[PDB]
Amino acid sequence: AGQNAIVAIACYSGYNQEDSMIMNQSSIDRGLFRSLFFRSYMDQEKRFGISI
Amino acid sequence: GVKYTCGACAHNFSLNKSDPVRCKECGHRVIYKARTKRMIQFDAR
Amino acid sequence: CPATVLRQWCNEFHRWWPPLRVVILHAIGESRVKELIDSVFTRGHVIITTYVGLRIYSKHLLKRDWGYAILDEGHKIRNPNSDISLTCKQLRTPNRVILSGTPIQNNLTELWSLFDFIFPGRLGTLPVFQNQFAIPINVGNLQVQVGYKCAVTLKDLISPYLLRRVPKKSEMVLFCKLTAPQHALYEKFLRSDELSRILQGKRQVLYGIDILRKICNHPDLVDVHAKRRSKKDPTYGSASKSGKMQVVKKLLELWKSQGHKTLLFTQTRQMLDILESFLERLNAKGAEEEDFVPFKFLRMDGTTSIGVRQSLVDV
Numbered sequence: 001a002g003q004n005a006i007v008a009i010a011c012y013s014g015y016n017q018e019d020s021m022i023m024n025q026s027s028i029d030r031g032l033f034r035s036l037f038f039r040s041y042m043d044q045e046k047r048f049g050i051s052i
Numbered sequence: 053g054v055k056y057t058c059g060a061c062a063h064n065f066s067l068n069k070s071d072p073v074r075c076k077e078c079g080h081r082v083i084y085k086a087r088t089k090r091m092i093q094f095d096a097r
Numbered sequence: 098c099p100a101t102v103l104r105q106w107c108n109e110f111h112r113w114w115p116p117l118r119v120v121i122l123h124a125i126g127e128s129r130v131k132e133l134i135d136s137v138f139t140r141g142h143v144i145i146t147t148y149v150g151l152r153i154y155s156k157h158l159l160k161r162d163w164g165y166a167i168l169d170e171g172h173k174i175r176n177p178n179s180d181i182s183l184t185c186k187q188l189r190t191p192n193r194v195i196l197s198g199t200p201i202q203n204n205l206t207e208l209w210s211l212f213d214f215i216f217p218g219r220l221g222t223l224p225v226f227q228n229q230f231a232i233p234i235n236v237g238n239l240q241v242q243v244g245y246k247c248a249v250t251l252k253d254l255i256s257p258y259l260l261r262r263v264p265k266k267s268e269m270v271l272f273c274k275l276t277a278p279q280h281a282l283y284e285k286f287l288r289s290d291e292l293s294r295i296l297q298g299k300r301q302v303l304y305g306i307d308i309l310r311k312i313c314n315h316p317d318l319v320d321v322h323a324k325r326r327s328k329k330d331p332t333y334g335s336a337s338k339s340g341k342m343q344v345v346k347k348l349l350e351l352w353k354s355q356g357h358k359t360l361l362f363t364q365t366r367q368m369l370d371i372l373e374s375f376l377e378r379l380n381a382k383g384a385e386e387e388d389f390v391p392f393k394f395l396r397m398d399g400t401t402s403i404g405v406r407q408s409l410v411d412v
């Protein structure tokens with residue numbers, strides 16, 4: 001669960017403040033932490049009466 | 053047109069709205085709508 | 098009289114006694130029926146009515162006095178407390194005659210209600226009629242002798258109020274068994290919440306014995322898609338699953354080659370679909386091979402028209 005990615009420590013962009021991180025776009029383009037999500041919708045016919 | 057495929061018996065077929073959910077040869081009630089042969093285009097990025 | 102004998106009833110008037118005038122209760126024999134009423138009592142002699150048609154013109158029929166009364170219907174009166182008593186027993190005439198050889202088929206309550214129409218109660222009220230001999234007859238020594246006298250009293254009380262007059266036949270009853278798929282569906286429905294729910298009182302037992310007869314005719318009738326596959330799915334019928342196809346196939350084919358005009362009898366038009374798919378498949382099998390003859394069936398029901406009747410009855 002997770003990936004081994006490269007991190008450096010500094011204050012370069014000023015955006016790293018306050019629980020924010022700065023990301024390499026090249027790794028994202030190559031697919032670092034790309035993932036697949038799947039959602040199952042369940043549906044069914046119902047019986048209002050016996051034949052309805 | 054609307055093709056259907058069996059569970060694991062690999063039976064390929066097509067139900068209509070006249071029959072219950074039942075793989076016609078294997079007698080398997082877990083059937084699956086066969087995928088569309090139609091092309092899907094991607095962006096590769 | 099019923100609507101199947103309306104013209105018949107006018108016919109014997111015309112042929113036996115032309116002097117008797119006659120008028121049926123229809124458009125001929127809202128004002129038009131009132132001009133029909135004009136001189137239907139002086140000029141008009143006998144008025145005919147269908148036993149559905151009285152409550153179409155009852156506003157101007159039950160009011161004036163009447164003479165002799167004939168009702169050719171002894172199974173659409175039965176027990177009291179119905180629209181029957183509402184439009185019938187309010188007539189004003191001692192003369193009251195019912196023409197039916199099957200008045201007693203369900204219970205003596207029907208007997209009391211039929212005796213009410215003719216006589217004003219030579220026996221007693223409905224509570225009196227019940228408390229007199231209802232239970233003793235059913236339960237029944239300790240019953241017989243006292244019951245014997247209490248019943249012969251009734252027989253002598255009502256006997257001069259209703260007349261009584263009466264090749265070979267073979268009655269073979271076959272006792273077939275429930276098949277394994279039938280026994281499975283029988284136990285499944287047997288142990289379910291709906292049966293107890295019916296028993297306690299929220300529903301009626303009439304809807305729980307109609308579905309357990311629905312499975313005995315054949316397994317494929319307790320399906321929720323009944324209408325959706327009745328006449329458009331040639332597997333809905335099937336054979337040998339009902340527990341009765343084999344004693345149907347064999348028994349009917351023993352007459353098919355023997356040339357015996359036979360009667361197939363059902364009660365539901367839903368099972369007719371299954372027995373009709375079955376016989377069409379029998380026809381297909383016979384026609385594909387040789388030395389056979391088409392089965393040639395037909396189905397008649399309320400869906401058809403009153404006009405057809407005799408025609409098929411004749412063909």
Ligand SMILES: [Zn+2]
Pocket residue numbers: 058059061062063075076077078079080
């Ligand atoms: Zn299969």
